[PDB]
Amino acid sequence: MERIPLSTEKKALKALRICEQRQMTEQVRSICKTMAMQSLCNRRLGSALSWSIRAKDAAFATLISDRFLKEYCERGNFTDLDLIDNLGSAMLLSDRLTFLGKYREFHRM
Amino acid sequence: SNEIPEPLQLDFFDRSQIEQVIANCEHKNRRGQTVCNVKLLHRVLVAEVNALQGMAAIGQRPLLMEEINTILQYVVERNKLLQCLHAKRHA
Amino acid sequence: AQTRLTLAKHNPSTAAIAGSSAAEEMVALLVQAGLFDTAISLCQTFKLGLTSIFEGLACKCIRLQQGGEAAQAEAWEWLAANQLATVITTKESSATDEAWRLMISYLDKYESKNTLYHHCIINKLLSHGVPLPNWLINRYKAMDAAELLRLYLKYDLLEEAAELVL
Amino acid sequence: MFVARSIAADHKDLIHDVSFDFHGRRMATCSSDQSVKVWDKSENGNWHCTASWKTHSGSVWRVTWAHPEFGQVLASCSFDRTAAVWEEIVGESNDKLRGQSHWVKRTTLVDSRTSVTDVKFAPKHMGLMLATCSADGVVRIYEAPDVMNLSQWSLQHEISCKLSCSCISWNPSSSRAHSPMIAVGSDDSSPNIMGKVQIYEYNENTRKYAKAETLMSVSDPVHDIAFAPNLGRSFHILAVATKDVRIFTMKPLRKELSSSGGVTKFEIHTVAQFDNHNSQVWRVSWNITGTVLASSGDDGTVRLWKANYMDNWKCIGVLKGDGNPVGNSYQGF
Amino acid sequence: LQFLRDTVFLRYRTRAYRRAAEKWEVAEAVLDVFYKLLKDYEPQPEDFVDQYVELQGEERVAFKPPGFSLMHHLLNESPMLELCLSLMEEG
């Protein structure tokens, strides 16, 4: 299953369930990073945040943070501050992610 | 001397897992709580929470230290209430 | 004044010593404590040389290469304070790779005067007796050729110089 | 029952090799027409010509593919004393599947002056590296630290295995305390040269790639080597296709400290030494699971073996290139 | 250990000195180094078995630790403990 793609729903759900039951997250993170890069190719938000939460990565998180910062610099301001505020504001993932969240809330502050 | 403990904390790991590790490491000697050497248990827990590595988790060191201190205070309160409950029941 | 403040925050008992000491002594104390960035800033402010900081960094790198996971876990606390925000791959939790990237970033952001720091690091590594890393060997082979043969006579390396001149 | 014909493809000159993506669907060819063609086999049962474009001017030979999870790149080998990597860049976003896609040259593999042997990829574990080799005995390892810049190739390892390396196989780690292994089969064009197989390990005490063990048995010019897929075991299996059918097994003995410093005590046992081809073999390939072995020859004969129960390989499929395939034996499932 | 037990501990009592404080100083040194060695070394079951290791092509066995034989001789009958009791009686 590490060579064929996975575009289904229930199949991948059962696969992830049996993986988290057997306690093995190597290929889980390998597929999660691919899903995260596929979402970043279309510039997603909520799905990318959910994939980053499920993967507990770092390089892809820094990449999407830099992409969001570049988008904010190009647009002048930020308007999608509520699209990435559904999974956070408590679980400290990383320093740069916490800083991005605190800036997104400082906006409304 | 019955001090009310605090509920489960630390949203990173699992308090049940920490309790299971403590019960597997330290056995039961003369108290109900599975504990032997407090300093040795603290050092073992510090080594366990430090061996998790972490690239961008450098800022979580004070949080981990305060969590270890909270668990230590909880164990201290448990021992302080057990040493009073056992004596009261014996009397 | 800010260096004395940092020294007092590290240990509040040597205030008079930090006030009466010199810039070289302050740089040596910062290197021994684990503040390579602050030591480099002190040296660049006082218009000196980063030879002591580079020797300390080479000693720390040798310690990291010679020690097990315990050395990595003990030196991570001092290595993370040197701004390790490089653009590398994922799952890179190795103190050796972190120190390598730190040295690369230092060399890219502050070039040497006349490659004297390179000879200093080479001598520091030869004093311990650890072979040079492959990336640094390739970089030095691409950037020079003669000074390596001239410095090999200190450690008496015959076959290496033979294949080099060949 | 198979719709077999006598003609295929569209290359008029001598077609060299082909390749297919790990996810399927996408394929690529390399011939003597100095133009590579990429095909897309659809679900309807037909594979039309998706693209065709020039790449090299000196007879392109090999062709490698990578997984889309780390970047869809294509590294091909040629006889023009150089090699480059092609990429597939798409535009727009994701409104109607994928928009306009095109082949581009993001970077060109440097450090290529002689005949390039193999420049395939390497297992991840500690990072996705690229192994560049030639016909001189020097193997370079490049890494891509910048995920947004595919042209960066930092050189962090340069090993000199001497002789003239031809084939290079990798063996990943089975756990967190295992090191990757590298097998190198040379081809000095002289069977009188004793020693053609070299083993390299990732020593944690030196952080390099020193010579773990050697083998003075195989002296003939090695043509291809293939390791068995790791299944969480300590021993390993190797298939060496040179002039006959050779399959060896490497068993560990002392893989700890003190007793094994810079070298490892590994015993190599010849578990299969067959020669039913009455000629020579070219390349050898393993199945995706580790149960089927495929190889051909210079006389126009393809031999495919399968596993049994005693770690033995027997000829199951025999095909004649110039003639017609004889025999019929399909066990099934 | 044997050199310090026989050639030193079982020879300084027979040899003469310039003053009486020399024997007390050497006894202090011996007792201090013995206490430090006993604090540094801990009994483990992995050191009691004969482990096979390849040393220059020879498979040599693992020798017994010195502290094991020391405490075994102390539990049985030790001239070191005899002299310790003698100096205790003297004190």
Side-chain angles (χ1 to χ4, degrees):
Chain A
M1 78 185 175
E2 276 323 289
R3 290 171 69 252
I4 55 174
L6 275 190
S7 295
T8 46
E9 287 86 48
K10 318 287 205 170
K11 206 164 210 315
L13 161 84
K14 291 168 76 173
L16 291 177
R17 282 279 91 81
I18 205 163
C19 284
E20 75 103 18
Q21 276 317 296
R22 295 308 184 275
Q23 276 90 44
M24 262 173 271
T25 178
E26 31 262 18
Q27 95 275 12
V28 170
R29 290 175 170 147
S30 314
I31 302 300
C32 282
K33 71 177 200 297
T34 320
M35 291 296 112
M37 80 100 69
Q38 282 285 338
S39 308
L40 193 59
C41 281
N42 209 5
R43 290 100 193 168
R44 272 294 276 258
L45 283 98
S47 171
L49 174 62
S50 173
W51 282 123
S52 68
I53 279 279
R54 287 178 269 176
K56 316 278 186 49
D57 287 341
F60 298 89
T62 311
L63 182 62
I64 65 171
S65 193
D66 293 331
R67 176 62 255 173
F68 274 129
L69 287 171
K70 282 185 299 282
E71 225 278 327
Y72 155 75
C73 290
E74 283 183 81
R75 279 193 308 117
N77 216 28
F78 212 82
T79 44
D80 289 355
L81 78 159
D82 286 329
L83 270 82
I84 46 178
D85 212 17
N86 320 291
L87 300 161
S89 304
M91 178 182 168
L92 302 188
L93 285 143
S94 66
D95 289 5
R96 65 271 208 288
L97 262 178
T98 311
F99 300 154
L100 191 131
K102 86 196 196 166
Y103 186 47
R104 286 293 103 85
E105 72 119 353
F106 176 74
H107 268 102
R108 279 275 87 81
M109 288 264 268
Chain B
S1 167
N2 315 290
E3 307 180 342
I4 296 303
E6 67 261 31
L8 307 186
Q9 305 304 126
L10 186 60
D11 61 329
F12 284 97
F13 223 54
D14 291 330
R15 264 287 270 258
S16 184
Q17 279 297 318
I18 274 96
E19 286 303 295
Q20 197 240 356
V21 165
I22 284 166
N24 292 337
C25 289
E26 313 271 65
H27 295 84
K28 167 169 83 68
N29 300 357
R30 60 175 63 92
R31 209 188 305 274
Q33 169 70 27
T34 61
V35 65
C36 308
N37 201 242
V38 188
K39 299 176 180 64
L40 184 63
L41 183 61
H42 178 273
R43 290 317 184 278
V44 161
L45 196 47
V46 159
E48 281 158 342
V49 304
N50 187 65
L52 315 174
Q53 309 163 339
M55 296 97 77
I58 312 299
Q60 311 311 304
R61 290 304 198 257
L63 271 85
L64 286 174
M65 283 193 283
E66 91 102 20
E67 283 283 343
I68 293 317
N69 291 318
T70 307
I71 269 90
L72 163 72
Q73 260 68 247
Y74 159 73
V75 171
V76 160
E77 290 176 353
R78 254 190 146 278
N79 299 149
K80 280 293 297 302
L81 78 96
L82 278 176
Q83 68 102 29
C84 168
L85 276 181
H86 291 324
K88 206 185 301 174
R89 287 193 307 116
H90 286 150
Chain C
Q2 79 100 27
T3 318
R4 178 164 70 253
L5 213 64
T6 312
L7 284 155
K9 282 178 168 65
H10 271 283
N11 190 17
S13 65
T14 62
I17 311 177
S20 50
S21 49
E24 188 54 53
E25 212 275 339
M26 250 76 89
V27 163
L29 274 185
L30 290 165
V31 162
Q32 287 162 306
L35 290 176
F36 295 90
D37 274 333
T38 86
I40 287 176
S41 70
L42 259 282
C43 261
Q44 289 182 359
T45 299
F46 265 94
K47 288 273 109 178
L48 307 176
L50 328 162
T51 175
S52 60
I53 308 111
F54 274 156
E55 288 286 297
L57 203 49
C59 188
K60 257 76 177 176
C61 180
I62 290 158
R63 273 172 263 180
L64 285 178
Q65 302 278 6
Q66 294 316 114
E69 314 300 315
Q72 320 286 97
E74 284 153 43
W76 267 335
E77 287 87 43
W78 303 112
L79 206 56
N82 283 316
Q83 196 65 75
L84 293 183
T86 175
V87 185
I88 56 173
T89 170
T90 185
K91 54 195 169 86
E92 273 290 319
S93 194
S94 168
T96 289
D97 307 335
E98 280 154 49
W100 278 343
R101 294 296 103 85
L102 186 65
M103 261 91 82
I104 285 159
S105 57
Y106 278 10
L107 182 60
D108 292 347
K109 81 186 209 312
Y110 279 121
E111 321 299 314
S112 299
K113 319 295 192 290
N114 286 93
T115 72
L116 190 61
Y117 302 129
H118 288 116
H119 324 317
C120 287
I121 299 309
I122 284 161
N123 283 120
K124 180 72 162 203
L125 200 43
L126 284 168
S127 67
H128 278 85
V130 186
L132 268 291
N134 219 316
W135 60 277
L136 189 51
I137 272 180
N138 297 320
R139 179 197 307 255
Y140 223 74
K141 167 246 293 180
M143 88 106 74
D144 257 336
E147 92 94 24
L148 195 53
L149 303 166
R150 264 99 186 280
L151 269 184
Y152 271 175
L153 295 171
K154 181 62 186 70
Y155 210 59
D156 295 331
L157 298 171
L158 305 182
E159 302 318 297
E160 303 192 6
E163 71 234 7
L164 272 186
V165 302
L166 278 163
Chain D
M1 79 105 75
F2 315 100
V3 200
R5 319 143 302 169
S6 60
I7 38 180
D10 212 0
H11 291 302
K12 299 311 199 178
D13 273 316
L14 306 177
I15 168 69
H16 271 69
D17 298 307
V18 311
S19 198
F20 66 102
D21 193 26
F22 300 102
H23 283 44
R25 305 198 83 259
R26 301 187 42 83
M27 276 91 75
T29 57
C30 291
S31 68
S32 290
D33 288 325
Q34 314 311 129
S35 45
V36 293
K37 308 188 177 171
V38 155
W39 310 67
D40 274 351
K41 169 71 169 37
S42 314
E43 310 311 290
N44 73 319
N46 283 354
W47 41 286
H48 52 79
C49 182
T50 326
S52 306
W53 77 108
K54 317 286 189 168
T55 286
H56 275 296
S57 284
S59 315
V60 56
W61 181 37
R62 280 173 69 258
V63 45
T64 56
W65 278 64
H67 304 274
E69 316 179 353
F70 332 111
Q72 192 50 260
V73 305
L74 259 76
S76 58
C77 274
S78 181
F79 304 135
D80 57 348
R81 315 279 92 83
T82 199
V85 187
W86 277 86
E87 286 86 2
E88 183 74 15
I89 283 190
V90 82
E92 289 184 42
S93 294
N94 194 8
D95 39 358
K96 291 309 157 288
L97 299 178
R98 286 301 175 97
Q100 40 262 11
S101 69
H102 44 85
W103 282 97
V104 286
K105 288 253 229 202
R106 186 68 158 83
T107 170
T108 294
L109 195 53
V110 296
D111 207 8
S112 311
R113 278 90 43 82
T114 169
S115 302
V116 184
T117 52
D118 54 282
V119 280
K120 20 179 173 279
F121 306 95
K124 200 203 271 293
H125 273 84
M126 217 58 71
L128 208 77
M129 310 286 115
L130 198 134
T132 308
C133 316
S134 299
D136 50 348
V138 178
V139 177
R140 281 91 59 196
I141 286 96
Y142 295 102
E143 61 108 12
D146 301 333
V147 285
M148 72 291 292
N149 191 11
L150 297 173
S151 306
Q152 222 287 331
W153 264 325
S154 303
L155 182 59
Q156 81 262 28
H157 270 341
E158 185 262 288
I159 320 295
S160 176
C161 63
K162 276 87 64 185
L163 302 175
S164 187
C165 53
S166 183
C167 34
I168 285 96
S169 184
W170 300 264
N171 200 267
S173 300
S174 293
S175 61
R176 75 198 50 81
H178 198 203
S179 42
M181 304 285 122
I182 287 96
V184 170
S186 298
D187 199 304
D188 308 345
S189 297
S190 186
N192 307 318
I193 303 302
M194 303 300 118
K196 292 291 182 84
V197 178
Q198 275 73 58
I199 303 165
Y200 279 88
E201 69 172 66
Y202 180 69
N203 202 349
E204 290 88 4
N205 270 309
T206 69
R207 282 87 38 187
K208 257 90 79 179
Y209 280 98
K211 188 185 302 199
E213 262 210 331
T214 195
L215 189 123
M216 296 290 118
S217 312
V218 174
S219 310
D220 305 1
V222 186
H223 280 158
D224 201 8
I225 48 174
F227 271 160
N230 295 8
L231 314 171
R233 337 156 299 197
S234 307
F235 71 103
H236 287 101
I237 323 287
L238 166 64
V240 194
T242 75
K243 309 292 160 311
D244 45 350
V245 192
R246 318 193 205 194
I247 291 105
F248 294 74
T249 294
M250 297 73 60
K251 311 272 301 182
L253 166 71
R254 291 289 193 175
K255 46 182 172 297
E256 294 178 353
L257 218 77
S258 82
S259 66
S260 290
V263 297
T264 53
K265 266 80 178 175
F266 271 58
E267 32 261 27
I268 298 100
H269 315 288
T270 156
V271 299
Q273 198 48 257
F274 301 112
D275 204 0
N276 300 318
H277 199 205
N278 317 119
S279 190
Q280 67 102 49
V281 279
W282 277 114
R283 304 276 97 84
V284 56
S285 69
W286 274 74
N287 201 23
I288 55 169
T289 82
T291 41
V292 194
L293 262 300
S295 292
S296 174
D298 53 347
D299 49 351
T301 308
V302 188
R303 28 208 299 127
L304 325 168
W305 317 262
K306 272 87 171 175
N308 298 91
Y309 62 99
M310 273 295 112
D311 287 333
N312 49 340
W313 312 98
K314 193 70 195 71
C315 262
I316 274 192
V318 170
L319 197 139
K320 254 296 295 187
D322 309 299
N324 287 2
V326 292
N328 272 292
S329 52
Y330 269 95
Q331 292 279 267
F333 276 75
Chain E
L1 190 68
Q2 293 303 111
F3 180 80
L4 288 187
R5 279 172 41 193
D6 309 339
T7 319
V8 178
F9 212 64
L10 284 165
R11 194 162 161 263
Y12 90 103
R13 278 303 189 84
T14 75
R15 289 185 295 164
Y17 339 97
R18 294 300 199 182
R19 79 260 192 184
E22 292 179 35
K23 63 154 65 68
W24 269 305
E25 282 164 279
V26 78
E28 284 164 293
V30 162
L31 284 153
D32 203 14
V33 301
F34 263 69
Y35 178 61
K36 276 145 171 168
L37 181 62
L38 197 65
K39 279 205 305 192
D40 292 332
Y41 159 71
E42 303 284 337
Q44 285 294 322
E46 299 301 302
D47 283 354
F48 294 151
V49 289
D50 284 354
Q51 294 295 107
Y52 293 156
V53 279
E54 307 207 307
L55 287 175
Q56 283 193 329
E58 291 175 29
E59 289 264 41
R60 310 183 183 153
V61 315
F63 300 100
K64 295 307 181 60
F68 151 74
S69 299
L70 172 65
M71 62 174 147
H72 153 267
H73 207 67
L74 280 157
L75 278 168
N76 286 144
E77 257 292 326
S78 34
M80 307 85 67
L81 191 57
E82 290 310 294
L83 203 43
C84 281
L85 260 83
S86 178
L87 69 96
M88 276 196 281
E89 298 310 300
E90 164 164 82

